[model samples]
Target: HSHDSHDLQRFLSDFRDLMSWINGIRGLVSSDELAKDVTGAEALLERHQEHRTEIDARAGTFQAFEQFGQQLLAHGHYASPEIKQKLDILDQERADLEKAWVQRRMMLDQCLELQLFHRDCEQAENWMAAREAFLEDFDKAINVQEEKIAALQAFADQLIAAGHYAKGDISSRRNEVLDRWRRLKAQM
Candidate 1:
């Protein structure tokens, strides 16, 4: 598997694990109809949620790589008007998610500062909900990016497998990839 595929799988696995923990807590809480003596469960949820967050942090790294690959696919080639519109939507989603994260974090902090354990519990619940929602969107976007890279690689493979390689187009593709890669490297 390609590096991107591996990365995506890791994200999927971790995400599923997070969902499991979230569901587990939901199940236990709803079934028992109480949060009493749930310290152990709370600790598990907190730890697993944190584990999921660590996994989620990898998303930025994956996106960076996708950006590089897309640049190679022709600098902003598919950043077409339509794609730009879609990207605008994504930007809005990101902004909203960020706002939610910030607000939730502040609420949690406030509850903790006031030493209101019950309120803090409520804050934690809200925090996880917002975070998971944001991460779901992020995970979906990564899948789309990975599909684009896979398509490009498959097309390249098809050319080679056809038994008569097209030199000019391949050169154009290679040059495009290398040029962008270099330019980005220098800029960085």
Candidate 2:
């Protein structure tokens, strides 16, 4: 699906699908089957931990964007003059990214809740499958922000060429965007 304005809607649909999947299976299984899967819980725990490590590896990137997001939300600071023009757009895009992140976090939290409560065949098998599916699409999900960042970089380059940013400004703000762009691209 296109990661445009409707991205959140589609994401929520998948999240809801997963929730329904859990609900559909919850009361249908026996304790014995659940117990059997619980016996293999240690192995699935490793997969879960590995999944977390993969996401946390990108923590530095999320942290930097989150810092910028906080500044935008809290102080509404604008450095380069052009930033003022793009501020609203940037804010909306940032908000969208954060929204997706929050939803994904909630999805994971609920998934874990079910896993812990059940910790059985459905939980073990379904969670790993769901985790894989979510992560698979999540890497694609950020393309919208990546495209936004790329455009910001292009705009910054134009500003730099037009003598809009001071040397120090370019070194800090534009460079930060470029760094973020390259980091995101490396992931792609």
Candidate 3:
């Protein structure tokens, strides 16, 4: 299935299938009956996978919620402690989801480490190819910015000239842009 699902459905289904596969594996490994702990683990794994995926997918939509909340609070929706609590919880949740993905990947890694797992040189070279392709794509994305930098600088000068924002703010924003520029160039 495509990872392009805008919501949790695809991720959940992937995890549901994974959970079932793991449980079925436990049953087969245990000689006639599955261990109770293994069964419990499967259920917990499924629950965690669903919870984790929910957070990960919803985190992508956070900018909208953040902007809405900002507008609402500005327009008299008092900054409820509940909103603050929700934001903190969501941050922790997204972190936990990242941990879960790392853990899941670790499980496979352990298996590979312990066994005669397969490897292909073509795959390693393919990853290098992907890195090069990403660099090419990124360079294309930034050239336009380079072309417009003078205009952007002029706009910034105008802003500073008009006192729309302080020179310090302009320096800070300029530093941010330069930082990203160097970072991207270094990555390339």
- Looking at model 1, residue 21 earns an lDDT score of 45
Candidate 1 error regions (>4 Å) = 1-58, 61-79, 116-188
Kindly report which residue pairs in candidate 3 clash with one another.
none
What is candidate 1's local distance difference test score? 0.43
Extract clashing residue pairs from model 1.
Answer: none
Residue-wise C-alpha lDDT for candidate 2, range 1-188, written one tens digit per residue: 44332433443343344344333333222112211243354444444455445544645654554454454445543332333334444445435544544444444433333333333223233433454454477666556455655555565465456543143454356565456446545654
Cα RMSD (angstroms) for every candidate in the order listed: 31.4, 27.4, 23.0
Ranking by TM-score: 3, 1, 2
Q: For model 1, what is the alpha-carbon lDDT of residue 18?
A: 41
Clash tally for model 2: 0
Number of clashing pairs per prediction, in order: 0, 0, 0
TM-score of each: 0.30, 0.24, 0.31
* Candidate lDDT (C-alpha), each: 0.43, 0.43, 0.45
Per-residue C-alpha lDDT of model 1 across residues 16-71, encoded as one tens digit per residue: 55445444433333322222334644544454456447545756854654354444
For candidate 1, report its TM-score. 0.30
